[PDB]
Amino acid sequence: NLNKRMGDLRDINGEAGAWARIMSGTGSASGGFSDNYTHVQVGVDKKHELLDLFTGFTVTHTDSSASADVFSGKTKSVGAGLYASAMFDSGAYIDLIGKYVHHDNEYTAGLGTRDYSTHSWYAGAEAGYRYHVTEDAWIEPQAELVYGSVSGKQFLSMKDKDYNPLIGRTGVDVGKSFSGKDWKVTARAGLGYQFDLLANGETVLRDASGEKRIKGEKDSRMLMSVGLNAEIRDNVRFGLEFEKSAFGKYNVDNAVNANFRYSFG
C-alpha cells in the first residue's frame, strides 16, 4: 500500500527524502486465533523527474504475538526491501516494492516450547488513478497484487514447508482537502475487497509470524479505512490511517498507521 507505507507523494519539491512508519494492529480468525503486532519501518530515497519516480531502500522491524486454543506465541521480525514509486502528473500511479523478511519465532504448545526461525520474499505491485471531481475533491480506484515465497513450517515436531501466498486487493478511496498557504490536510476514506490464495497451502502451521492466519488456503475480506494526509510548509508531511475489515475468516479488528516524511534537497 503506497499511501500507507509512504504518504502522499504528489508534487513533493526536493530530490531527496527520508521517512518512517508505525503500524499497530490486531486481528482474529477461527479456532480462537487472535494476533496483535507493532510494525516499525524506515526508509530513504531519491526522486527523479521526466513522472515523479521516487526510488529507495527500506528496513522494517515487527514485534508480533498471537494466541489460539492450541498455542501462544511470539515473533520478532526484521526486514529490508527496495521500492520504486511512479507518481504520474496525469493522476495515475504505479508502485513496485520487493522485500525480504526474517522471522524468529516462538511457539507453545505433544510437548515443548519451540524456538525456530522462518523467512519470506515478497514482491508487490500497486496501480491506481486519482481523478479530481473538483479541485477540493477526488476519487481514486486502486488495485494491488502481492506475490510471495514464504518458507515456513508444518507439523511431535516441525518439518519445514514452503508455499506461495498470492494476495490481491481492489478498492476505492475518496478524499477532500483544506488548505492555507503553508498547511494542507486531506481527509480520506476507502472501501475495498481483499483476497489471498496460499498456494500449497493447507498444511502450513499458524504461528505469531503474521503468515498463515487461517485454516486452509483461501480467504476474502471487506476493507474499510479512514484517514488524513497532512502537509506542512515545503518539507514535512505526515499521514494517519485507521483500518478494519469484515466477513473474513481472518479479520483486522483494529489497525493504526502513521507515516512521516521529511523531504529535502
Tab-separated table of C-alpha atoms in Angstrom:
chain	number	residue	atom	x	y	z
A	1	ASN	CA	0.000	0.000	0.000
A	2	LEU	CA	1.708	3.131	-1.259
A	3	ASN	CA	-0.236	5.645	0.817
A	4	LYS	CA	0.170	3.519	3.941
A	5	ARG	CA	3.875	2.821	3.615
A	6	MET	CA	4.668	6.299	2.418
A	7	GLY	CA	2.209	9.064	2.181
A	8	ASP	CA	1.018	11.497	-0.329
A	9	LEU	CA	3.971	11.672	-2.893
A	10	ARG	CA	2.391	14.159	-5.298
A	11	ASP	CA	4.368	17.319	-6.123
A	12	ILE	CA	6.996	16.904	-3.410
A	13	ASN	CA	9.682	19.551	-4.009
A	14	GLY	CA	13.138	18.219	-3.228
A	15	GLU	CA	15.020	15.348	-4.775
A	16	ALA	CA	15.963	13.633	-1.517
A	17	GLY	CA	13.674	12.021	1.097
A	18	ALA	CA	13.514	10.143	4.414
A	19	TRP	CA	10.533	8.595	6.122
A	20	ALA	CA	9.254	6.424	8.947
A	21	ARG	CA	6.086	4.438	9.545
A	22	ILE	CA	4.499	2.810	12.562
A	23	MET	CA	1.635	0.325	12.238
A	24	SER	CA	-0.025	-1.206	15.248
A	25	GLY	CA	-2.940	-3.618	14.837
A	26	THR	CA	-4.980	-6.617	15.995
A	27	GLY	CA	-6.973	-9.279	14.147
A	28	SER	CA	-8.814	-12.567	14.724
A	29	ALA	CA	-9.526	-15.753	12.852
A	30	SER	CA	-11.160	-19.078	13.795
A	31	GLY	CA	-10.343	-21.707	16.461
A	32	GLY	CA	-9.840	-18.888	18.991
A	33	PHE	CA	-6.996	-17.366	16.955
A	34	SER	CA	-6.126	-13.736	17.547
A	35	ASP	CA	-2.989	-11.692	16.976
A	36	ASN	CA	-1.506	-8.289	17.645
A	37	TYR	CA	1.532	-6.563	16.243
A	38	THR	CA	3.600	-3.391	16.196
A	39	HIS	CA	5.429	-2.837	12.929
A	40	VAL	CA	8.077	-0.114	12.683
A	41	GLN	CA	9.693	0.912	9.398
A	42	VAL	CA	12.069	3.460	7.950
A	43	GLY	CA	13.396	4.340	4.503
A	44	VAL	CA	15.294	6.726	2.265
A	45	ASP	CA	15.067	7.603	-1.436
A	46	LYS	CA	15.846	9.835	-4.417
A	47	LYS	CA	13.046	11.425	-6.516
A	48	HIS	CA	13.523	11.630	-10.323
A	49	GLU	CA	11.652	13.708	-12.947
A	50	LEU	CA	10.730	13.081	-16.622
A	51	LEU	CA	6.934	11.385	-13.981
A	52	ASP	CA	7.889	11.596	-10.325
A	53	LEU	CA	9.979	8.465	-9.734
A	54	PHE	CA	10.758	8.041	-6.027
A	55	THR	CA	13.130	5.042	-5.547
A	56	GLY	CA	14.598	3.855	-2.277
A	57	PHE	CA	15.526	1.330	0.382
A	58	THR	CA	13.581	0.390	3.479
A	59	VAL	CA	14.136	-1.565	6.687
A	60	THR	CA	11.403	-2.971	8.950
A	61	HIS	CA	11.023	-4.437	12.448
A	62	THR	CA	7.917	-6.287	13.650
A	63	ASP	CA	7.101	-7.323	17.217
A	64	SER	CA	4.203	-9.730	16.974
A	65	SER	CA	2.271	-12.059	19.276
A	66	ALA	CA	-0.612	-14.442	18.692
A	67	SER	CA	-2.750	-16.983	20.511
A	68	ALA	CA	-5.187	-19.755	19.550
A	69	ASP	CA	-6.845	-22.582	21.510
A	70	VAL	CA	-3.801	-24.728	20.706
A	71	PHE	CA	-0.868	-22.365	21.377
A	72	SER	CA	0.502	-18.996	22.383
A	73	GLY	CA	3.469	-17.491	20.581
A	74	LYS	CA	5.654	-14.500	19.811
A	75	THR	CA	7.706	-13.393	16.808
A	76	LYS	CA	10.352	-10.708	16.436
A	77	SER	CA	10.934	-9.999	12.744
A	78	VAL	CA	13.352	-7.847	10.703
A	79	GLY	CA	13.141	-6.873	7.029
A	80	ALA	CA	14.735	-4.998	4.168
A	81	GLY	CA	13.491	-4.000	0.723
A	82	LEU	CA	13.746	-1.876	-2.422
A	83	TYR	CA	10.922	0.247	-3.849
A	84	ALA	CA	10.016	2.271	-6.945
A	85	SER	CA	7.040	4.626	-6.791
A	86	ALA	CA	5.949	6.307	-10.009
A	87	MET	CA	3.723	9.306	-9.437
A	88	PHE	CA	2.483	10.482	-12.812
A	89	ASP	CA	1.316	14.059	-13.281
A	90	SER	CA	-1.725	12.688	-15.166
A	91	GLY	CA	-3.124	11.302	-11.883
A	92	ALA	CA	-2.137	7.661	-12.380
A	93	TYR	CA	0.399	5.993	-10.091
A	94	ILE	CA	2.276	2.705	-10.054
A	95	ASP	CA	4.146	1.402	-7.008
A	96	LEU	CA	6.604	-1.537	-7.064
A	97	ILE	CA	8.197	-2.954	-3.894
A	98	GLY	CA	10.375	-6.031	-3.248
A	99	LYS	CA	11.256	-7.016	0.333
A	100	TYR	CA	12.821	-9.831	2.396
A	101	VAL	CA	11.575	-10.703	5.893
A	102	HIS	CA	13.229	-12.807	8.586
A	103	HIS	CA	11.015	-14.125	11.372
A	104	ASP	CA	12.176	-15.754	14.523
A	105	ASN	CA	9.733	-17.391	16.155
A	106	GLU	CA	8.377	-18.859	19.405
A	107	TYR	CA	5.505	-21.343	19.668
A	108	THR	CA	3.985	-23.124	22.682
A	109	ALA	CA	2.314	-25.568	22.916
A	110	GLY	CA	2.875	-33.404	22.441
A	111	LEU	CA	5.265	-31.076	24.271
A	112	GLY	CA	7.812	-28.284	24.378
A	113	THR	CA	8.034	-24.587	23.800
A	114	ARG	CA	9.646	-24.386	20.361
A	115	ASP	CA	12.121	-21.714	19.261
A	116	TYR	CA	12.582	-21.584	15.482
A	117	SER	CA	13.067	-19.285	12.512
A	118	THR	CA	11.434	-18.674	9.124
A	119	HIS	CA	11.643	-16.204	6.228
A	120	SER	CA	9.880	-14.868	3.152
A	121	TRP	CA	10.353	-12.963	-0.095
A	122	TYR	CA	7.604	-10.628	-1.233
A	123	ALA	CA	7.114	-8.695	-4.468
A	124	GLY	CA	4.270	-6.180	-4.665
A	125	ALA	CA	2.650	-4.095	-7.386
A	126	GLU	CA	0.045	-1.348	-6.982
A	127	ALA	CA	-1.648	0.724	-9.665
A	128	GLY	CA	-4.243	3.449	-9.113
A	129	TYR	CA	-5.679	6.636	-10.574
A	130	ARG	CA	-6.740	9.820	-8.826
A	131	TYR	CA	-9.491	11.668	-10.668
A	132	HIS	CA	-10.345	15.129	-9.307
A	133	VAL	CA	-14.058	15.948	-9.398
A	134	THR	CA	-13.392	19.418	-8.052
A	135	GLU	CA	-10.025	20.883	-7.031
A	136	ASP	CA	-11.053	20.100	-3.431
A	137	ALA	CA	-12.272	16.505	-4.046
A	138	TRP	CA	-11.040	13.369	-5.838
A	139	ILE	CA	-11.846	9.711	-6.336
A	140	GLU	CA	-9.084	7.084	-6.605
A	141	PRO	CA	-9.713	3.473	-7.674
A	142	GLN	CA	-6.819	1.194	-6.646
A	143	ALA	CA	-5.548	-2.294	-7.376
A	144	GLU	CA	-2.607	-4.113	-5.804
A	145	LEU	CA	-1.271	-7.636	-6.144
A	146	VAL	CA	1.302	-9.156	-3.786
A	147	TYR	CA	3.073	-12.445	-4.519
A	148	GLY	CA	5.338	-14.171	-2.009
A	149	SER	CA	7.693	-17.085	-1.435
A	150	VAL	CA	7.364	-17.957	2.218
A	151	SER	CA	9.325	-20.818	3.671
A	152	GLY	CA	7.556	-21.603	6.939
A	153	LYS	CA	6.854	-24.720	8.971
A	154	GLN	CA	4.442	-27.663	9.138
A	155	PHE	CA	3.779	-30.256	11.856
A	156	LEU	CA	5.553	-34.081	17.608
A	157	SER	CA	7.933	-31.850	15.587
A	158	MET	CA	8.234	-29.135	12.902
A	159	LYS	CA	9.334	-30.016	9.367
A	160	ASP	CA	9.761	-27.033	7.038
A	161	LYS	CA	7.116	-26.288	4.378
A	162	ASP	CA	7.477	-23.797	1.501
A	163	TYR	CA	4.473	-22.000	-0.029
A	164	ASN	CA	3.448	-19.087	-2.205
A	165	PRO	CA	0.857	-16.626	-0.942
A	166	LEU	CA	-0.912	-14.571	-3.581
A	167	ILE	CA	-2.720	-11.598	-2.085
A	168	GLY	CA	-4.944	-9.346	-4.207
A	169	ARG	CA	-6.613	-6.025	-3.419
A	170	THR	CA	-9.001	-3.740	-5.233
A	171	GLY	CA	-10.746	-0.727	-3.736
A	172	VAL	CA	-11.541	2.954	-3.987
A	173	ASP	CA	-10.518	5.914	-1.849
A	174	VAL	CA	-12.199	9.316	-1.796
A	175	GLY	CA	-10.715	12.491	-0.312
A	176	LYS	CA	-11.361	16.193	0.244
A	177	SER	CA	-8.725	18.807	1.178
A	178	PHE	CA	-8.432	22.017	3.220
A	179	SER	CA	-5.517	24.385	2.803
A	180	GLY	CA	-3.707	27.569	3.859
A	181	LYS	CA	-0.512	28.862	2.220
A	182	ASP	CA	1.511	26.534	4.491
A	183	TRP	CA	-0.722	23.715	5.688
A	184	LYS	CA	-2.700	21.240	3.590
A	185	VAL	CA	-4.930	18.472	5.112
A	186	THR	CA	-6.782	15.838	3.069
A	187	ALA	CA	-9.437	13.826	4.892
A	188	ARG	CA	-9.929	10.483	3.175
A	189	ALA	CA	-11.856	7.221	3.363
A	190	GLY	CA	-11.870	3.998	1.362
A	191	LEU	CA	-13.651	0.729	0.709
A	192	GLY	CA	-12.243	-2.362	-0.976
A	193	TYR	CA	-12.053	-6.136	-1.155
A	194	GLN	CA	-9.010	-8.257	-0.354
A	195	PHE	CA	-8.250	-11.884	-1.211
A	196	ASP	CA	-5.396	-14.240	-0.591
A	197	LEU	CA	-4.553	-17.608	-2.048
A	198	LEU	CA	-1.963	-19.570	-0.094
A	199	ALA	CA	-0.598	-21.992	-2.700
A	200	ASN	CA	0.390	-25.333	-1.024
A	201	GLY	CA	-1.148	-24.453	1.346
A	202	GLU	CA	-3.459	-26.311	3.773
A	203	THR	CA	-0.664	-27.797	5.895
A	204	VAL	CA	1.368	-24.662	6.882
A	205	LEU	CA	1.366	-24.044	10.663
A	206	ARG	CA	-0.166	-20.852	12.102
A	207	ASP	CA	2.216	-19.058	14.491
A	208	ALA	CA	2.782	-15.460	15.641
A	209	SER	CA	4.550	-14.646	12.367
A	210	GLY	CA	1.655	-12.993	10.573
A	211	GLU	CA	1.857	-15.529	7.752
A	212	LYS	CA	-0.821	-18.104	7.524
A	213	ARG	CA	-3.546	-16.624	9.771
A	214	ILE	CA	-6.206	-19.095	8.659
A	215	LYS	CA	-7.241	-22.699	8.193
A	216	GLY	CA	-6.848	-23.634	4.526
A	217	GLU	CA	-5.599	-21.512	1.653
A	218	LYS	CA	-8.386	-19.105	0.635
A	219	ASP	CA	-9.983	-16.081	2.324
A	220	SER	CA	-11.814	-12.837	1.420
A	221	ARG	CA	-12.432	-9.626	3.452
A	222	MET	CA	-14.168	-6.309	3.022
A	223	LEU	CA	-11.810	-3.421	3.744
A	224	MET	CA	-12.866	-0.196	5.475
A	225	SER	CA	-10.457	2.699	6.112
A	226	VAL	CA	-10.421	6.362	7.179
A	227	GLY	CA	-7.507	8.809	7.474
A	228	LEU	CA	-5.576	12.025	6.830
A	229	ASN	CA	-2.731	13.377	4.702
A	230	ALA	CA	-1.215	16.393	6.439
A	231	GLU	CA	1.189	18.713	4.594
A	232	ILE	CA	3.300	21.338	6.463
A	233	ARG	CA	5.144	24.106	4.504
A	234	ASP	CA	7.640	22.550	1.989
A	235	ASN	CA	9.461	19.656	3.642
A	236	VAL	CA	7.280	17.878	6.200
A	237	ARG	CA	4.307	15.550	5.513
A	238	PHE	CA	2.501	13.045	7.764
A	239	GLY	CA	-0.490	10.759	7.365
A	240	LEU	CA	-2.593	8.698	9.704
A	241	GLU	CA	-4.968	5.825	8.822
A	242	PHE	CA	-7.433	3.670	10.824
A	243	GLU	CA	-8.449	0.315	9.266
A	244	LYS	CA	-10.796	-2.576	9.988
A	245	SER	CA	-12.219	-5.482	7.969
A	246	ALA	CA	-15.293	-7.726	7.909
A	247	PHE	CA	-16.641	-11.083	6.694
A	248	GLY	CA	-13.203	-12.741	6.542
A	249	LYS	CA	-12.022	-15.970	8.109
A	250	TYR	CA	-9.294	-13.701	9.456
A	251	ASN	CA	-10.272	-10.093	10.168
A	252	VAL	CA	-8.458	-6.946	11.158
A	253	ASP	CA	-10.361	-5.766	14.216
A	254	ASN	CA	-8.143	-2.699	14.606
A	255	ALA	CA	-5.173	-1.107	12.947
A	256	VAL	CA	-3.442	2.219	13.063
A	257	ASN	CA	-0.926	3.514	10.574
A	258	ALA	CA	1.139	6.694	10.791
A	259	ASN	CA	3.644	7.925	8.074
A	260	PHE	CA	6.106	10.774	8.497
A	261	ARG	CA	8.105	12.261	5.597
A	262	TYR	CA	10.994	14.728	5.751
A	263	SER	CA	11.513	15.686	2.081
A	264	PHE	CA	14.583	17.802	1.237
A	265	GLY	CA	17.144	18.759	-1.433
